[PDB]
Design a protein around this ligand. Structure first.
Ligand SMILES: Nc1nc2c(c(=O)[nH]1)N[C@H]1C(S)=C(S)[C@@H](COP(=O)(O)OP(=O)(O)OC[C@H]3O[C@@H](n4cnc5c(=O)[nH]c(N)nc54)[C@H](O)[C@@H]3O)O[C@H]1N2
Ligand SMILES: Nc1nc2c(c(=O)[nH]1)N[C@H]1C(S)=C(S)[C@@H](COP(=O)(O)OP(=O)(O)OC[C@H]3O[C@@H](n4cnc5c(=O)[nH]c(N)nc54)[C@H](O)[C@@H]3O)O[C@H]1N2
Ligand code: SF4
Ligand code: SF4
Ligand code: SF4
Ligand code: SF4
Ligand code: FES
Ligand code: FES
Ligand SMILES: [Mo+6]
Ligand SMILES: [S]
Lengths: 148, 69, 949
């Protein structure tokens, strides 16, 4: 039921102007990544070539090339969040899970996002569509508690 | 069992038929300008011998074909 | 001469008003759009550049063409800086020196120092632009690099291993400077978007979406390999051999587009062939065949010595020239005295030059004393020269290929330019991506329809054979409505005939609503297409073998010309009725006789005023009767009264219809000479054999599809020791003529003096101007890029009443399906030149593009062996289920002789020029294991007859 979903998605975005990006968003949202078995149909329905459909997928970071773990943990690494000790939070958390920055697994996936808008709340994280701020060395406990 | 020459003649006739004005003159002129001695001779022999499977337009145009030496 | 040829200017040339600017103390005048870099180039002041080329639009990647301009803050790039009046620019200030040094430093920090052991040494644009700026040190101790195979602590994750999948070029990314002149070229020039930049930033690497180039959507055109400065994408012939020293301008021996190449030569050893940026046929672009496939000239199978047999059943005999010619001439004179001069004949070759063609038609007319000559034109594009002769007066094209740059619509009947004429398809796509519209009347989905970034497009997927019904319907639509141009008709054409034509076409029986039953195309779509074609300001028709090669080809061509005349798409750039000629010098061959009804110049043979001039110039008595045509030749030989034949540069067996009949007619032939490079299918029935010369060893000209006369130069030396014209004059003098030609210049002078149009043609002209359209007399000295610009040639166009006649190749119970025969990009017609190259990768076996629904019932699957039970023979082939073709339609290819495809083809042909019916044949496709009863026998004969002793 992959071709079906993909065809439905493409039908949903038929006639738009520059509809590649939205189509790719929807694809990623459906499966979890942009499968190489879905570079061709998109290109065909949009009149592009596999090459461009691959280049677009490569340029952008939000488009996964392979799936992530059951959970995901994005952790800002920008100036503000760095200021109020993001490094410490990072260390504590990666020791808790045992996965360094960028190092993924089947359980989780620790990565950087470089901003969330929570600059005032300097230490900021995104755990499974849930934003968290003021991440002290204690909040990490609950971060991992609800996150097996 | 169609002779290639008869076939070509009938084809040319079928074409030149739908045209306006003199329809046989052009046919004869074409057959004269394109075909060779033995072929023209064979076609004239056909039209003189009254072989069946031939367009009457060709039968009418034959006399006007370039003479064979 | 122009600088665009010798020098690589920075950016593409623009049209606009004169703008004056001062480049580093040098006054310059260039169009407004033109960039600073290109103007500086035109001024002689060179500014360092690595990522900017003329072929593609400029990008600000290198940052090496920075120049200080008065009134502009900072150091802006010349490539992306349009000129302005009175602008004073400074090319080389100290600051700019420093900055360019820094940028080259950053480059080379990530580049291997494999100079002195790399393929592109002396032909690399990174090395000269690194020496130009004056880099003397690199201060960046790099740890992160793409080339280093082994990094600290182990393998480099960035390192990408070389790719040698494609037999013609290799991709070593270790040396890539990301500039994207490969991407830009593949996307802008060729039009097949097979290359992209995978990654973001330093991690960015050029790549096709596939493991290797071969598995991708790459057609091997080498426009990336031509535009890659840093040996990343490099020809293998430059790896095996050293970098070439000299250059020589020649042309391709394919496709009739006449892509002008420059062969890069190292001594006498051909290293590579790269376009010249000259010739309006190709502005620095090419395809697989011309670019790479030139290794047939250096093949071991090539025959280099004459061979005489005396009996097909007997083996060959390697022999010198003298006694070969003696035997030949003896047999010829015997047969001549016995059966007459009309018992002889020649078959000229388009593949050869026009000089050789002239010599051959002379040999057939002056020496032999007959009018029995012919050529490949007779199976392809002969109806064209009848239709456009009956309508306009010229049996030739109407526009060049630059005209397409100004078109606004493209109507393609029976063509597949993506395969047939790739370099035309490129410049077509260049326009299609720029808004222009497209109508395709082919029954088979062509790749031109599925081009990327396409504008609007209509596809009339009809049934093969019904090509005139559709045109008639278009006409009925345009006439019932009122969209046509009355001013055009009244000025350039006749009205009294137009009235009859309209009253005929206006009949409601030739309407789109009634033809849908027999044609298979919808009515609404057809009406829409017609309205679109009629409405557009500058439309253009391009037609090929889907109209000509049928039972009604001349009729269809006439209908097409009627359309083009009615609508008013004639006598202007962007509009015309262009036939897409095939082989090189088909136009030149047809112009230099090569027909049994004319003399050089499309003059009839019965013309006394012409025969007089020719008898006067040749000092010999000629005949006034038109000669036999190949079908006639063979039918005669079967019946008798035809004994001799001198086949030049042609394969009358594999490349002709009803293989059985043609073989039977070629067998009953006391003498059949062969004059090809290789031992061919036709030479299996030969008694004599004379080696030939390739376009590399030749010297002369080629007359392509757009009437352009390109010049062919000698780069190698003849391996047989003699060119084709030399062999022809050998034979002619050995028979008794008495010619003395030491150079084709004299021959061309003769041609000029004899026929008009070439009256002003001289090799000096061809060198200086470069190329000429053959209608070049004292009037129109420069040439005639466009025909019928001021009134037609006959004086007034003619509207002819075309009609649809049911073809005799209709389908029935035991022959339900239909058949078609076409081509591929990689391989050429018979592949006697191309199968002997590395182009057997893309196509090494001919296949059958059957439809899925027409496969399930029979039990066919992709990769299965099937038999084509036709009426005129039988054959076996490997199947391919595809939704490309329509149901009840089939498509085969004739490139490979292992599969005898033309044994299925029937003897049915056109009415005027007798051009065979290659594109329609009622077949039956079934499943089978045993190949055939014909293929077996053919193989046996070819094996027992190609033995030398
Ligand atoms: N089923 C089917 N059959 C077809 C067609 C089709 O569409 N479908 N198309 C028809 C048409 S369009 C044509 S053009 C023919 C084309 O096909 P042919 O008429 O067969 O011409 P070529 O493919 O060049 O090869 C013929 C021989 O001439 C040799 N030759 C090549 N260059 C030279 C040269 O410079 N000098 C000399 N002395 N010899 C040379 C070649 O090596 C080869 O041995 O095929 C025809 N047959
Ligand atoms: N790489 C490469 N280049 C070549 C050649 C080659 O073999 N290989 N061949 C050379 C030669 S000598 C030739 S003649 C030229 C010309 O070459 P083209 O003019 O491109 O002709 P083809 O590719 O044979 O087929 C024409 C297209 O129209 C379709 N068609 C079939 N029947 C009909 C019909 O009834 N009506 C209509 N409207 N369309 C139909 C055919 O199926 C096919 O897709 O190209 C030259 N260039
Ligand atoms: S591509 Fe040019 S600069 Fe790089 S190693 Fe080869 S010759 Fe040297
Ligand atoms: S060879 Fe031609 S088609 Fe292939 S990648 Fe290079 S430019 Fe593109
Ligand atoms: S492959 Fe060649 S042309 Fe393409 S980005 Fe690399 S250096 Fe430039
Ligand atoms: S085959 Fe045609 S397009 Fe290709 S290089 Fe030769 S002339 Fe040019
Ligand atoms: S900077 Fe990390 S919150 Fe905006
Ligand atoms: S040099 Fe003009 S930007 Fe590359
Ligand atoms: Mo051809
Ligand atoms: S041709």
């Amino acid at each position: 039921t992959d071709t079906a979903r993909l065809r439905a998605i493409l039908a949903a975005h038929r006639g738009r102007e520059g509809a590649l990006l939205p189509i790719l968003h929807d694809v990623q949202a459906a499966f979890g990544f942009i499968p190489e078995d879905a570079y061709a149909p998109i290109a065909a329905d949009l009149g592009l070539t596999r090459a461009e459909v691959a280049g677009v997928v490569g340029f952008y970071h939000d488009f996964r090339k392979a799936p992530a773990g059951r959970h995901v943990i994005k952790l800002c690494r920008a100036e503000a969040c760095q200021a109020m000790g993001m490094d410490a939070v990072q260390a504590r958390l990666e020791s808790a899970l045992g996965l360094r920055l960028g190092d993924s697994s089947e359980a989780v996936t620790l990565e950087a996002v470089y901003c969330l808008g929570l600059c005032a709340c300097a230490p900021a994280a995104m755990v499974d569509d849930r934003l968290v701020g003021r991440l002290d060395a204690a909040a990490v406990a609950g971060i991992v508690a609800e996150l097996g | 069992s169609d002779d290639k020459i008869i076939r070509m003649a009938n084809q040319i006739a079928a074409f030149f038929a739908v045209q306006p004005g003199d329809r046989a003159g052009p046919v004869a002129a074409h057959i004269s300008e394109n075909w060779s001695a033995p072929m023209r001779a064979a076609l004239l022999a056909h039209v003189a011998a009254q072989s069946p499977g031939l367009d009457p337009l060709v039968i009418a145009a034959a006399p006007q074909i370039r003479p064979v030496p | 001469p122009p600088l665009d040829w010798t020098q690589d200017m920075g950016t593409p040339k623009r049209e606009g008003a004169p703008v004056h600017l001062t480049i580093d103390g040098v006054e310059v005048t260039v169009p407004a759009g033109t960039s600073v870099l290109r103007a500086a180039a035109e001024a002689g002041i060179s500014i360092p550049k690595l990522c900017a080329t003329d072929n593609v639009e400029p990008v600000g990647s290198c940052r090496l063409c920075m120049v200080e301009i008065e009134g502009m803050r900072g150091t802006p790039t010349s490539c992306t800086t349009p000129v302005a009046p009175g602008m004073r620019v400074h090319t080389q200030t100290p600051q700019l020196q420093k900055l360019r040094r820094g940028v080259m430093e950053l480059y080379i920090s990530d580049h291997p120092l494999d100079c002195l052991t790399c393929a592109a040494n002396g032909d690399c644009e990174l090395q000269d632009m690194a020496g130009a700026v004056g880099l003397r040190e690199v201060r960046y101790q790099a740890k992160d690099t793409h080339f280093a195979r082994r990094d600290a602590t182990g393998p480099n994750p960035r390192y990408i291993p070389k790719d040698n999948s494609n037999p013609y070029f290799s991709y070593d990314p270790a040396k890539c400077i990301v500039c994207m002149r490969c991407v830009r070229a593949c996307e802008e020039v060729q039009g097949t978007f097979a290359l992209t930049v995978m990654g973001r930033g330093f991690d960015a690497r050029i790549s096709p979406a596939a493991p290797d180039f071969l598995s991708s959507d790459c057609v091997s055109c080498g426009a990336c390999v031509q535009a890659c400065p840093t040996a990343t994408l490099v020809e293998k012939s430059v790896e095996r051999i050293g970098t070439p020293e000299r250059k020589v301008v020649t042309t391709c021996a394919y496709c009739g587009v006449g892509c002008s190449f420059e062969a890069h030569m190292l001594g006498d050893q051909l290293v590579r062939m790269v376009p010249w940026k000259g010739g309006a046929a190709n502005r620095g672009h090419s395809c697989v065949k011309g670019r790479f496939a030139y290794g047939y000239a250096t093949h071991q199978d090539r025959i280099l010595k004459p061979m005489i047999r005396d009996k097909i059943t007997d083996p060959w005999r390697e022999v010198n020239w003298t006694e070969a010619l003696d035997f030949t001439a003896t047999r010829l004179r015997a047969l001549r005295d016995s059966h007459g001069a009309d018992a002889l004949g020649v078959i000229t070759s388009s593949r050869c030059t026009n000089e050789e063609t002239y010599l051959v038609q002379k040999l057939a007319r002056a020496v032999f004393g007959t009018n029995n000559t012919d050529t490949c034109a007779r199976v392809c594009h002969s109806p064209t020269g009848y239709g456009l002769k009956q309508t306009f007066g010229t049996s030739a094209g109407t526009q060049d290929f630059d005209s397409v740059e100004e078109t606004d619509l493209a109507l393609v009947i029976g063509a597949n330019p993506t395969d047939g004429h790739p370099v035309f398809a490129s410049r077509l796509r260049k326009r299609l991506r720029a808004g222009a519209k497209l109508i395709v009347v082919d029954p088979r989905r062509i790749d031109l329809l599925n081009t990327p970034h396409r504008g609007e497009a209509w596809h009339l997927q009809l049934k093969p054979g019904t090509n005139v019904a559709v045109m008639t319907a278009m006409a009925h639509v345009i006439v019932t409505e009122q969209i046509f141009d009355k001013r055009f008709i009244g000025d350039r054409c006749d009205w009294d005939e137009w009235a009859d034509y309209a009253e005929f076409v206006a009949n409601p029986e030739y309407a789109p609503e009634a033809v849908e039953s027999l044609t298979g195309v919808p009515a609404g779509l057809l009406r829409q297409a017609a309205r679109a074609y009629a409405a557009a300001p500058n439309a253009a028709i391009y037609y090929g073998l889907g109209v000509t090669e049928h039972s009604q080809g001349s009729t269809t061509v006439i209908a097409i010309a009627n359309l083009a005349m009615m609508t008013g798409n004639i006598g202007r750039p962007g509009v015309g009725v262009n036939p897409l000629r095939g082989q090189n010098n088909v136009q030149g061959s047809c112009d230099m006789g090569s027909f049994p009804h004319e003399f050089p110049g499309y003059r009839h043979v019965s013309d006394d005023a012409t025969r007089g001039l020719f008898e006067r110039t040749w000092g010999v008595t000629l005949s006034s009767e038109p000669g036999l045509r190949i079908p006639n030749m063979l039918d005669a030989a079967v019946e008798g009264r035809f004994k001799a034949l001198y086949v030049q540069g042609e394969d009358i067996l594999q490349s002709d219809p009803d293989t059985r009949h043609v073989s039977a007619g070629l067998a009953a032939m006391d003498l059949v000479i062969v004059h090809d490079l290789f031992l061919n299918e036709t030479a299996n029935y030969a008694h004599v054999f004379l080696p030939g010369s390739t376009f590399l060893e030749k010297d002369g000209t080629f007359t392509n599809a757009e009437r352009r006369i390109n010049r062919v130069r000698r780069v190698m030396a003849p391996k047989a020791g003699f060119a084709d014209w030399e062999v022809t004059q050998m034979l002619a003098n050995a028979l008794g003529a008495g010619w003395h030609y030491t150079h084709p210049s004299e021959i061309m002078a003769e041609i000029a003096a004899t026929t008009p149009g070439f009256a002003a043609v001289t090799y000096e002209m061809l060198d200086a101007r470069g190329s000429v359209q053959w209608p070049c007399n004292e009037k129109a000295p420069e040439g005639s890029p466009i025909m019928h610009v001021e009134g037609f040639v006959r004086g007034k166009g003619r509207f002819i009443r075309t009609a649809y006649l049911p073809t005799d190749e209709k389908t029935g119970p035991r022959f339900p399906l239909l058949l078609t025969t076409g081509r591929i990009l990689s391989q050429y017609n018979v592949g006697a030149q191309t199968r002997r190259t590395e182009n057997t990768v893309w196509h090494g076996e001919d296949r059958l593009e059957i439809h899925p629904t027409d496969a399930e019932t029979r039990g066919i699957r992709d990769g299965d062996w099937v038999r084509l039970a036709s009426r005129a023979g039988e054959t076996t082939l490997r199947a391919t289920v595809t939704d490309r073709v329509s149901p009840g339609v089939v498509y085969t290819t004739f490139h490979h002789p292992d599969t005898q495809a033309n044994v299925v083809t029937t003897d049915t042909s056109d009415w005027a020029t007798n051009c065979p019916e290659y594109k329609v044949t009622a077949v039956q496709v079934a499943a089978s294991n045993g190949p055939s009863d014909w293929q077996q026998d053919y193989a046996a004969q070819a094996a027992a007859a190609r033995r030398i002793e």
